Amino acid sequence: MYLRITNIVESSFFTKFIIYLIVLNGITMGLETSKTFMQSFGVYTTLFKQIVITIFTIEIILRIYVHRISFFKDPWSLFDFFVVAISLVPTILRVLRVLRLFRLVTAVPQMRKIVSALISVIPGMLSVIALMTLFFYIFAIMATQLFGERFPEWFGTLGESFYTLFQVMTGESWSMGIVRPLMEVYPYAWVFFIPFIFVVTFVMINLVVAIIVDAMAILNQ
Amino acid sequence: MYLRITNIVESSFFTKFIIYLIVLNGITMGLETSKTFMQSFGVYTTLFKQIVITIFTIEIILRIYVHRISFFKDPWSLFDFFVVAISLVPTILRVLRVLRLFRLVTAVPQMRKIVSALISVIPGMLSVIALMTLFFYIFAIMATQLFGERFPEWFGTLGESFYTLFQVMTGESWSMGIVRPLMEVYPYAWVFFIPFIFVVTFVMINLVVAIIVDAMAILNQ
Amino acid sequence: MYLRITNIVESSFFTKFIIYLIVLNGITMGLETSKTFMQSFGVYTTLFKQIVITIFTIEIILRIYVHRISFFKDPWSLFDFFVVAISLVPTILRVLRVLRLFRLVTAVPQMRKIVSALISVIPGMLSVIALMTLFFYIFAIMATQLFGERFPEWFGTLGESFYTLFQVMTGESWSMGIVRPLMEVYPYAWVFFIPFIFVVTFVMINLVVAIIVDAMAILNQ
Amino acid sequence: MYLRITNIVESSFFTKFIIYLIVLNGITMGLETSKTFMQSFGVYTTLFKQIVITIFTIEIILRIYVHRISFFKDPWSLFDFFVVAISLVPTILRVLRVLRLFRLVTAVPQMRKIVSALISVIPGMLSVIALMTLFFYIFAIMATQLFGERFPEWFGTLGESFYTLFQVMTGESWSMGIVRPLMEVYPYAWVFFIPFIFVVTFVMINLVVAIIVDAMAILNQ
Ligand SMILES: CCCCCCCCCCCCCC(=O)OC[C@H](COP(=O)(O)OCC[N+](C)(C)C)OC(=O)CCCCCCCCCCCCC
Ligand SMILES: CCCCCCCCCCCCCC(=O)OC[C@H](COP(=O)(O)OCC[N+](C)(C)C)OC(=O)CCCCCCCCCCCCC
Ligand SMILES: CCCCCCCCCCCCCC(=O)OC[C@H](COP(=O)(O)OCC[N+](C)(C)C)OC(=O)CCCCCCCCCCCCC
Ligand SMILES: CCCCCCCCCCCCCC(=O)OC[C@H](COP(=O)(O)OCC[N+](C)(C)C)OC(=O)CCCCCCCCCCCCC
Ligand SMILES: CCCCCCCCCCCCCC(=O)OC[C@H](COP(=O)(O)OCC[N+](C)(C)C)OC(=O)CCCCCCCCCCCCC
Ligand SMILES: CCCCCCCCCCCCCC(=O)OC[C@H](COP(=O)(O)OCC[N+](C)(C)C)OC(=O)CCCCCCCCCCCCC
Ligand code: NA
Ligand code: NA
């Protein structure tokens, strides 16, 4: 029995059928935004969602059976179990059920290759991320103390300062929307932001080049 | 006769004459925006367009003759045939007739080299493009469900959500124009967009570095 | 006595205790933005700041003792001494005391590695920075003379021209916010800014690629 | 006499004295924006400008003497002669006299190295620039025909369309400022701009990577 059930679970066709269920359910989720289409086929849509979630849950049961230790030590099946379990509980969280469509990435081998390649790079940049978060923390405290009183919408609390600094980093309306109105009152805020812009852009560039060399040295040898 | 006609078609000078026709027709298309110049020489312009399209169509006939199987299996001549045929039909589509100027790229060898080099890179990034389209699909459904009611202009339907997410990806007015007005009502939309910005920017950077390594390894060996 | 005191200063645990003091003081600085929390525990916060600054100052004394010549010839301890001394003087400068949190970078070995790696790149780009500053100087003088009278907010003095040019370089509202309102009066300002944008973007790209090759050649050999 | 005059012109100190004149004249040009400083020392400033331009012109005469054929076949001295001659003619052109400060780049060896390195890259990208200019031409004609009537400020003539397309390429207010107001009337303009944005960004990325490989292969061998 274990032989038959594992030869079914690890068979190509079981994964293919759940892929087709994933694709049809993704189209289903894409169609429920329409008020008109919901009015047309609410009952059919809900029925389809019930049957596909039943098949996905029984699939998760079979998979957690065939590999019990491996299921909770494999991030892909961990993610599948988490998304299925989240989709299971009814009432808010309805929005996060759309993350089940990421299971299309779980099933497809090429998408899995891409995502593993993407994840393997973070170990090379955790350090720079930590430095950047500390630098953001420091300059956000400075911005809140300096401009929080006169411009509470942008720096009144620490969080809005973190937000404004992330925005200035992105270089989106940093001068016209933030710095120039600050200079309308605090005429020497550029001593804060021009060094901030220089520093944060410089660090982002260095992060990119470090990523380049780490992804290239695995090929140069 | 086949000898003479192919020695004329594949001759340097036939392609050169059609190049000069392409250049003169490009100037012609560049001049028809002027209301004043149209008033001045409408009849001369229309006459020139008729004669050049006749020469281009007879050229396409001769080329489709000398290489019949090759014509429909060669993307350059496929594009030339398509643009000439589109320009042929009269009445809207008048705007797309300007794409005939891309035939200057078809004729010139260096432009052909550049375009082939550009196309040869997409096989290395189709996977990342597919992942990005799926990710855009998922977060666009989420954005439509969350913000479609209170901000229908940006997320009322799925398409406007795809548009707003592409824009936020470009980092054009993502905070002042979208996120901050959302926080005016939904105070916790940054939990959606800050991860979205981080993720989408990160994926774009990885796409660029993968393109770099694929275009460099063809030289390192 | 010198043996014991240096075996204490260069011991792992003294640096670890000052790290924990750094972290607790960073949380403390992060909490003083709250008007509510200040009202709650002003006396406790001030007491903690006094005791931690006393420990940091005695630490700086011990370190400047164990290595006197090295202290003023080591940029890390130079920075630590500078930030501690700045934090020492009471009354403005209260904002700059937050830079003591950068001492977390001083203590942590990995952060030190990152920062040294970042600094080692500037010798490869001082030349390009000098050229860019000269180019900014020249075009800022030009912008002040041309547009300073009709648009004094952006080019009335040299400094506001430097600012506007840095902004245009960043590509933030360069056309809608600057160039188009200029063309509302000076219709041929794009002859100034389009070459400026082309040139400044081109130089920034070349700076990035030069940084790439300098950081890669240290690995290729 | 030729021996003495060339040993003076090509001597280190003649170039150093003209460098000091360049630096002092650059400060002079930097000070004339001030209405107050002009009121203070107009006569002194004009006198200094007269004497430095006399020394620069006699220097250009001596240099064009020592190397007559080389002077008009050397781009650096060509630029020096051009800027000095432009500065010579009085009356508009007063703004372009500031380009004499680029002669600081001419004199300094390191700046010359940087600029030659920058120029040596364009031969590798003239082709891509030509393709991009043709693509801009085509889509600008399309934009003028489509949106010139309803939005003449952005596409009424060909030039304003070239400008708007360059701006959209830069990704500055492309959606909120251009595309969305167009969709207020022409609801299907994104079929024009989303492909335009994709294409133009993609080509710019490929230009950058080609520059990288051309500047790296000169080192890999
Ligand atoms: C470890 C690997 C993955 C790392 C990816 C993430 C790295 C950054 C982690 C940041 C940790 C700190 C998060 C944080 O401080 O968030 C604070 C704000 C909260 O805003 P909040 O005050 O809640 O606004 C609501 C106002 N309310 C309550 C009255 C309604 O929320 C924000 O505004 C967040 C904005 C972005 C913060 C940027 C922090 C530094 C990012 C550096 C990343 C690398 C850049 C090259
Ligand atoms: C004006 C807007 C776009 C209008 C339609 C665009 C499509 C038509 C353009 C045709 C242009 C000519 C195509 C072409 O040159 O293809 C050659 C490339 C490069 O060759 P290469 O990789 O050197 O040769 C490999 C062949 N091998 C392995 C047997 C030695 O070999 C390949 O083609 C590799 C396959 C890549 C296919 C991906 C092409 C997708 C283009 C879609 C453009 C949509 C724009 C939004
Ligand atoms: C295969 C090789 C070449 C690949 C290049 C293209 C890759 C992306 C394909 C996207 C396929 C899905 C297209 C799509 O969903 O378009 C939906 C919207 C339509 O807006 P729509 O709802 O029609 O607005 C009109 C409103 N109405 C009807 C009432 C007047 O139209 C849009 O808003 C389109 C906006 C861009 C969509 C971005 C989708 C993901 C792009 C990821 C590309 C890589 C990024 C690094
Ligand atoms: C918070 C805002 C900034 C506050 C002030 C910033 C300045 C103080 C920061 C001190 C941090 C520690 C400095 C440091 O680690 O320098 C080490 C680097 C890298 O060493 P490395 O290149 O590995 O060693 C080469 C030595 N050799 C050839 C004999 C083997 O060796 C070098 O230093 C090479 C020389 C480069 C000097 C350029 C540094 C300019 C920094 C200016 C920052 C201004 C921000 C706007
Ligand atoms: C050496 C290694 C590290 C190098 C990093 C820094 C490199 C740039 C150094 C710039 C030196 C010149 C600084 C400068 O000219 O600042 C002038 C403006 C001052 O504005 P200001 O006139 O005080 O405005 C206040 C108005 N008021 C007095 C009536 C209230 O202040 C500003 O607006 C500054 C804006 C940025 C200036 C950009 C100058 C060229 C930067 C090129 C950097 C590389 C780019 C790829
Ligand atoms: C060869 C090596 C160096 C190459 C660098 C330059 C490459 C681009 C050359 C462009 C040649 C065509 C220039 C052109 O068409 O300019 C037309 C517009 C003129 O605006 P205009 O109609 O005069 O506006 C005034 C209105 N009026 C008369 C009534 C007052 O003037 C503009 O709007 C210019 C805006 C930029 C045009 C962008 C053309 C394609 C650039 C592609 C560069 C590479 C991008 C990756
Ligand atoms: Na912007
Ligand atoms: Na931008």
Author numbering:
A (entry chain A), B (entry chain A), C (entry chain A), D (entry chain A): 1001 to 1091, 1097 to 1226
From the paper:
Among BacNavs, NavAb, cloned from Arcobacter butzleri, is the most critical contributor, since its full-length structure of Nav at atomic resolution was first resolved.
The L176GNK mutant showed only a half reduction of current in 40 mM extracellular calcium condition. In non-calcium ion condition, the observed additional electron density of the extra cavity was at 3.7 Å from Cα carbon of L176G residue and assigned as a water molecule. MD simulation indicates that water molecules are also more likely to be present in the extra cavity of L176G and L176A mutants (z = 0 Å), which is also consistent with the electron density of the crystal structure of the L176G mutants. Small-side-chain mutation of Leu176 creates extra cavities where the original leucine side chains were.
